[PDB]
Amino acid sequence: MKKIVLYGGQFNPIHTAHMIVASEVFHELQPDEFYFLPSFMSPLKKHHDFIDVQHRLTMIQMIIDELGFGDICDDEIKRGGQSYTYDTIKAFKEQHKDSELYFVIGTDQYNQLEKWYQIEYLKEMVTFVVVNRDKNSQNVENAMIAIQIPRVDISSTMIRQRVSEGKSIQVLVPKSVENYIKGEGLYE
């Protein structure tokens, strides 16, 4: 019964397009609970030798403050290693047995779901909720939920690139995160 949405990501940094995704999914699905799920290391992505956790968590909190909804699921941070969603979900479900689970992904992940660890099992444990990225609409199978959002081509990679360049990131991230990135010297 009780509807729980988890929204997974590197969030390095979280940005305005992540907010649009969270907001649209949350307003459409009206879940009982909404979790931003920051990875320790996102499978299929490269990582630095040192994995920042604290700056990422702080900026996520800033998005929660601005949105007026949400919580952070720290499971993957605590676990460490490669953050396979199957493992996370198996353990999370054990702790939330009376709840229907939703996992929010964009087009880019949806197009490579066959590369996800234990995906045949994972498809049985969550309802994937897919938002359009780099296109204006996404089609999904009946077992999944497609949510159409205004197309906004912002990435975390874009944010880090601009900052290292010395290029402004105003609006692309909320003012709180912009000031935080600047005061902390992130990505410089």
Interface residues toward a copy of itself, by CB under 8 A: 16, 19-20, 23-24, 27, 66-67, 136, 150-154, 158, 167-168, 170-172, 175
Residue 62 binds to ligand DND (criterion: CB under 6 A): no
- Please give the single-letter amino acid code of residue 130: V
H/E segment holding residue 69: none
DSSP bridge pairs for 173: 170
For residue 16, state whether it binds ligand DND (rule: CB under 6 A): no
Q: Which residues, other chains included, contact 77 with Cβ-Cβ below 8 Å and sequence gap of 6+?
A: 38, 40, 53, 57
Shortest Å, Cβ 55 to a copy of itself? 22
Confirm if 34 and 19 have CB atoms less than 8 A apart. Answer: no
Q: Binding residue for ligand DND (CB under 6 A) from 67, 79, 111, 116?
A: 116
Nearer to ligand DND by Cβ, of 98 and 169: the residue is 169
- Sole residue written with tokens 């490579």: 112
**3-state secondary structure at position 33:** strand
Applying CB under 6 A, does 177 fall inside the site for ligand DND?
no
Binding segment (CB under 6 A) for ligand DND, from list 36-44, 63-71, 93-101, 180-188: 36-44
